[PDB]
C-alpha cells in the first residue's frame, strides 16, 4: 500500500511544553525548558516541531503549561506561517497528561486517526512516519519509542521490559534501581517520551484518566504502566527511524538536563566532527530567523587581531580582538578587548567588558560581565560567585550578577 | 500636523532597475534593498519595481524577502515589467490603478538612507509639480550627472542632462548641483507629461526634467534635509557603486572599525531576504593552529579553517580552507578558497572555486593576465575567468 | 515640525481583552472578530507595536491573532505581542498593566496607547497623539456626548476652556449633565494616551496602594486629574468617517440587542459603518472560503434575498433571506424564513425553520421546523430571550431541547 | 520499497506556460490546481516558467509566495517550443539537485495525486512516464497518441496527428497523452542538453522528446484512473483544457449546479490561491425596494446586487449588479458592473468590464454576434475593447 505518505496526513503531533527545567532565565527570570537558546540561533522545541514537519506531521499542538512569554513568542515569530486551509498549523493550547485532558475538547475538533505525543524539550533528529507506520503494523493502541542508556543515568528515564514482537511487558517510572537490560546490560532499556496513540482510544483512555482521584495524570507515572498492563503498548526501538548522516553513528538524543549536558552538547557543534549534524539539508531544523549584521571583527584598543579555535560566532557578535577557543557566541554578543573565552557558551546578547577570562561556563541571555572579571579558574570563588556543577561547569545568570552589585540593563 | 504623515499614504514609490540593483552588499544585502527599505521607514508601502529586464535573481530576491505584504492595508512591491520613462509610460495602465495623489520615482542602484516623506513634504510646500533631489558634487565627474542651476526658492533655473562642460555652483565653485535621479512628482501632472511625451529622447532627465523646468513647476530638494545619517558632522552618504573599485571601497568601508554607513542603525532598518544560516563556524586548520580575523565580516554559513582575514567582507556559506591569507577582499556567497591561497585586493564573484594554492593580488601583470585588474590594482575573478584557466567549476 | 510622523513610531499600543469565546474575539460583520478594529486602527495609524493583553486565555483570541495579526518582520519595529495576565466590584483594568510592566518596559516606548479591545470604531490615533503633545498634557483621555440615561455606564468628565480635565468620576448614580446639553453627558472612552515613564512610575505607585482597585477608570483618571495632568480629546477630531456630516461611530456592543444591532446594520442600504473604505480597512483573518452558492430548494424554487449579507461558504437552498447577516458556512436547508437574523459560523438551519429577530451561536444545528421569534413566551422559555424582544440560541440550549449537536 | 513518501520528496515539479492565470470557478485561477496538486502530493518544490505576464507574476507573488526557503519548498519564477523552455533555466534546475522531475502543464483542471504516478514511474523503471486518458476519436487529433503494449510501455508516439489512430478498448475513444511526464532528473538534464547541443528538432515534448523515448523503449505510460483524485469514486475522471470559449463557460457553470462535477468542498484535496481580503456578498433592495431572486448560482466576496434575478451564474470577485437585472447562465469575472435593467445570457463578461445601463446580450443572436465574439455553439464573450469600439466609456 502507499500508507507511509498518507498516515503523517492522518496524524496530529502534540507537544508539551512548559514545565521548566533549566536553571536558565530569558529577559523576565524565568523560563521553561522547550524555549531554551541553543546552538546559536535555535531553540530546543524548533527540533520536536522541524521532525514533525520534515516527517509529513504539519499538525502541531503546542501546550505551553504556565503562560511563559518567549515560548509563545518563539511559536508566533518562527512557527506562525501556515495555510489552515491546506490542513496545516500550529496551535497554541493554554493550561504530563493533565494539560493534554484540559484541551481535549480542541484536540477532538482536529479529528485525528492517530495522535503523536512529542516532549518539546529534547534534542533530536527522528522521522516520525516511519514510527507511525510500525505503530499501523505493530497495530498497538500506544507505541513507545524507546533506547538502550547507561545504568547510572536509567533513574532519570522510565524504564521498559519488551517481548519478542516488542509488546511492553513491563514498563517502571524512574525506579532508582533501574533493572538492566536482560541481555547485554552494559545498560538499562529507557522509553524517549515518545508516544502514538491511535486518536479513540486515547481520548477515551484520558477521559477515564481524569476522573480517578489518586492517579497522577501523567503518562509516565500514571498513563503509560496502565497502558502497559493491558497489553496494548508496543516499543519502537529508536533507531529505526532516527534520523542521522553519519548510518555509524549511535543515535543522537540528549535531554539537556543538566548544566553539564547543555554546555556539552552546545559547545560539540563547535568541534570539528560535531556529533549533531546541522548542516544536513535533508532534515532541516526550522526557527525564528532574526535578521542580524555579519558577525563583526574588529581589532582590540591595542590595534592586535583576533584568533579563534574550534568556535561559533552568530549573527551580530562584534569581537575586538580577543581569543575564542571552543565556545559558541549566540547572537549579538559584545566580547571587548583583551579577553580570553574558553570553552563558554554565551547566550545572546551576552557584554563581556574589557580584560574578562571566561572558561567553562555558560553566560546566561543579556549577561553584561563588568570590566577584568574572571570566571572558570578558582573553583572556590567561583562557586561563591555563581553556581558551579560537580564537573566543574559554571552558570552564569544576570541576577547572579546583581545580587553581586553589576547593574544588568 | 496631519499633512506629515498623510503625504505618504497618498504616495506610490516606482524602483527602476537595470542586474545592477541584484548585487550583492555587505554580506547580506542586495542594493535595492537600501530604497524599498527607505521607502517602508518613509511610510510609503506601496512600491513599483520595475525590472529592465526580468531578472531572475531580482525577481526572485523580491519574491523571497520582499512578498510579505497584506494588500488589502494598502501595500505591496509590484513586479513590472518593461529611455528610462519609456518603462514607466508601458506600465501606466498598472500605474494609474493605484490611485495615487504622488509619485516617488527612485533608483533602486544607489546605496544611501533617505527619508522620502520630508521630501514629500519640501515638495508640497514649495508647490512643485516636480521635485528633484540634489546634491553637490565634484564638477569632473558631473559629466556624468543631470546638473541643474536654482534660485533663491530652489527652484530650477536651468537644467542639462550629462553636460560635456558642467557648469560650477556660483558659491562653491569647486563641485556642481548634481541631481540623484531621484523624483517626486504629482501623479496627474506625471501622467500627462508620459502621455505628451510618448507622442515624441523618452529619459527623465535628458527629456522630462528639461520640459518641467522650461514651464517653472521643477523645484530642487537638498539632499541633506532627509539624508538619514548618525553621525551629523558629516557628509552625506550616497554611493553608486559602478566600478568595481567604488564596489570593493564602499564593502570594505562596512568592515572598519568605524564605518560611514551605519549598519546597527536600529531607527531605520534596511529590510532583505533573512537567509536561514548555521552560524560562521571558525575550526582548526590541518596543523591544529588556531584562525586570525582582524577588522573582517564573516556572514552566517561560512566555514573557515585558520587562515588569517584581514580587512576582508565574507558573504555567506563562503569556505576558507586551511593556511589562507586574505587581505582586503570581498568574497561572494558560496565562494570556495582552497587550500594555501593567499588573496589581496580583489572581489571574488559568486560561487567561485579557487583552486589549491592560488596567489592572487601581489603580481599585478600575471592577475591582469589571468583575470580583470582595474587601474587602481583591484582584481575581479569570476566563474568564467576560472574555466578559462581550466579550473572545474562544480 | 513633522510631528505626526514621528509620534506613532515612537508610541506602543495596549490592546486590552477581558462564555468561552471572550468579548474582543466575538465574530461581527460575517468575517471580523471585534478586536480586528482597535489592531486594525493601530495599523492605520502608524502604531505597528501593539500589545494584546488578554485578562482571560482565549485560545480563540490567541489563534485568532496567530491566523491573522502574526504577519510582522520584528526587525522593522513591528509586532503584535500577546501578553498575558493572570486575574473587587471593578475588574482590574490597570492590574493586567501592570503584571507586564517589565516587557512593556523592554519595549522603550516615548508615549503608550491604552485601548479596550471590545468596542467597535474607526480613530485615526495619530490625531490624538499630536493633541496629546499639543496640549502638553501627561494624560489624554478620548471624550464623546452620550445619552445621560446610559451615561452612569461610562466614565463622566467635566473639562474647562483648554479641554484639560477639571473633575472625573467613574461610573456616577447621577451623572452630571454637559453645559451645552444637559440630555447628554461627556463620557471617557477608555482610550488614553500616556506619557511612557509617566504611566510608569503611576502603576508601580498604584500597585502598592491597596484602597486602589487598579482600575484606570476609577482611581487613576482621578489622581492624575487632581494633580492637573489630564486633558480631553474629542473624538471628532480622530475619529474616521466616510461621510464628514454623520456623528461619530462607537459601539459597545455589550449588550445583546447592541450585538444584534451592530451587526443587521451592515445589512442595511446604507449602513452607519462603513466596511468598505479604502481608506481605512479592517484586517482580520483571511480564510479561504468557496463562494457563497445559492441552489434550488427540494422543489426547484429559487431564493429571495432581501437586504441581507451572505459570507463565503455558505449554502442555501431556495428560502428567504431577509435582514440577515449568515456568516461563513452557514447551511440553510429548503423552505427557510430567516428574518432580521445573524447566523455565526457553520450553523446548520434545518428545512421549514422561521427565525425572527434572533442570534444563533456558531455550529448551532435547528432541527426541521423549528420556529423562533414569533412566540414570546414560548421562545424565552426555550432560549435566551432579551427584555426588547431578541433570542439567544447556543449549542447548549439546543441540547437540552433533545436536538443533537453532532 | 518500504516507504513510497520519500519519492515525491526527492522531486521537483515544473510548470510550464496567460492562460494558467485565467480565473476560474469565482475564486482560483487556473495554474492554482498544478500547483496545489504538487503541494497536495507532497511536492513542495516548483518551478513556474512564464513568459512577462504581469497577472501571473502577481499571483504566485500573492498566493504562491508564502515558503521557508530553508525547508526545501519554494516556487520560484523562471523566465524563458515546450522542451526549450526547460533547457533555458537547466542551469538553475539542475542545482535544485531532484532526483525526479515532474513536468506538467498549467493550463488544464484536473487533480491528481502526482506520487502516485511516481510510485508507477519507479515501479515500472522508466525513464519517462506519460500520463495517459482516452480522448474521443474526433478531438483525439489534437492531442498526442499513443499506442502500448500489455505492460503499458509506449510502442507508438505520434504528436497532433490529422489521422488519429482508433483504440481498441474504445474505438470511439484513442489513448492521449496529458502533458504530464515523470523523468529521471539526469536523464531529463541529458535529452535536454543533447537536443538543444546537437538535434534541430522543434523542441517540443511531444514533436521531439517523447518519440526519442519511445524509439529507446524508455517511455512508459500511466493511467490516468490509477492517480486521479475524486470524490465519487464510480465516476468519470475529470480533465478540462478551457480553450475553447465554450468549454470555459460550461466549466465555470458546472460549479453552480446541483451537483457539480468538480467538488471544491474536499477537504482532503484542498486547491490552494490568493485568499483576498473580501467582504461578504451583499444583498441589498432595488430601486423599488423590492427583494432579489437567487437560483443555482455563485455569488464571490465584495459583490453586491441589487434586487435582479441571477439564474444558473459565476460572479467573480467585486461584481456590482445594479437593479432589474436578469442574468442567466453568465460567468462574470472580477469587478465587473452591470448597470440597470440588463438582461444577460449564455455569456461571459470578463475583467472590469462596465455594461452600460439597458445592454441585452443572449436574445438576438444576430444582434450578439454583431456586438463582440459569438461562438459557433451560441456563447458570447465581451471584452471592454469591445464596448471602447461600441462606444461605451470604461476605465471609471
Same mark, same amino acid.
Given at each position: 500500500? /502507499? ?25 523576565? =527570570? ?23 514537519? =520534515?516527517?509529513?506531521?504539519?499538525? /502541531? ?27 496545516? !498549523?500550529?496551535?497554541?493550547?493554554? #493550561? ?6 484540559? =484541551? ?7 479529528? #485525528? ?5 512529542? #516532549? ?50 513491563? !514498563? ?64 519502537? *526501538? !529508536? *533507531? ?43 532534515? *532541516? ?50 566580547? =571587548? ?62 541576577? /547572579? ?9
Amino acid at each position: 500500500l /502507499m500508507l507511509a505518505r498518507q498516515l503523517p496526513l492522518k496524524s496530529v503531533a502534540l507537544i508539551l511544553a512548559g514545565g521548566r527545567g533549566t536553571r536558565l532565565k530569558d529577559l523576565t =527570570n524565568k523560563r521553561a525548558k522547550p524555549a531554551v537558546h541553543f546552538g546559536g540561533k535555535f531553540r530546543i522545541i524548533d527540533f520536536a516541531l522541524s521532525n514533525c514537519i =520534515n516527517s509529513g506531521i504539519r499538525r /502541531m499542538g503546542v501546550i505551553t503549561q504556565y503562560q511563559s512569554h518567549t515560548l509563545v513568542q518563539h511559536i508566533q515569530r518562527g512557527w506562525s506561517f501556515f495555510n489552515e486551509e491546506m490542513n496545516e !498549523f500550529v496551535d497554541l493550547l493554554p #493550561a504530563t497528561a493533565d494539560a493534554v485532558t484540559q =484541551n481535549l475538547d480542541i484536540i477532538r475538533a482536529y479529528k #485525528a486517526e492517530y495522535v503523536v505525543i512529542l #516532549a518539546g524539550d529534547h534534542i533530536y533528529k527522528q522521522d516520525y512516519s516511519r514510527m507511525l507506520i510500525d505503530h499501523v503494523e505493530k497495530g498497538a493502541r500506544c507505541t513507545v519509542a524507546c533506547m538502550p542508556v547507561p545504568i547510572e543515568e536509567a533513574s532519570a528515564f522510565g524504564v521498559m521490559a519488551v517481548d519478542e514482537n516488542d509488546k511492553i511487558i513491563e !514498563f517502571v517510572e524512574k525506579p532508582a534501581n533501574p533493572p538492566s537490560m536482560p541481555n547485554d546490560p552494559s545498560k538499562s532499556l529507557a522509553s524517549m517520551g515518545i508516544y502514538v496513540f491511535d486518536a479513540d482510544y486515547l481520548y477515551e483512555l484520558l477521559e477515564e484518566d481524569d476522573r480517578d482521584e489518586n492517579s497522577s495524570h501523567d503518562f509516565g507515572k500514571d498513563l503509560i504502566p496502565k497502558i502497559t498492563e493491558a497489553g496494548l503498548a508496543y516499543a519502537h *526501538p !529508536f *533507531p529505526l527511524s532516527c534520523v542521522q548522516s553519519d548510518p555509524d553513528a549511535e543515535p543522537y538524543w540528549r535531554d539537556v538536563g543538566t548544566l553539564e549536558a547543555y554546555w556539552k552538547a552546545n559547545l560539540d557543534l563547535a568541534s570539528v566532527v560535531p556529533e549533531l549534524d546541522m548542516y544536513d539539508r535533508n532534515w *532541516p531544523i526550522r526557527t525564528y530567523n532574526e535578521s542580524l549584521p555579519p558577525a563583526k571583527f574588529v581589532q582590540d584598543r591595542s590595534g592586535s587581531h583576533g584568533m579563534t579555535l574550534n568556535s561559533l560566532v552568530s549573527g551580530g557578535c562584534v569581537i575586538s580582538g580577543s581569543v575564542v577557543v571552543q565556545s559558541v557566541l549566540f547572537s549579538r554578543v559584545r566580547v =571587548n578587548s583583551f579577553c580570553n573565552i574558553d570553552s563558554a557558551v554565551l547566550l545572546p546578547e551576552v557584554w563581556v567588558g574589557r580584560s574578562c577570562r571566561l572558561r567553562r561556563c555558560v553566560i546566561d541571555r543579556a549577561c553584561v560581565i563588568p570590566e577584568g572579571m574572571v570566571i572558570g579558574e578558582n573553583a572556590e570563588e567561583d562557586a561563591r560567585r555563581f553556581y558551579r556543577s560537580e564537573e566543574g561547569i559554571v552558570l552564569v545568570t544576570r541576577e /547572579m550578577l546583581r545580587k553581586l552589585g553589576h547593574k544588568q540593563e
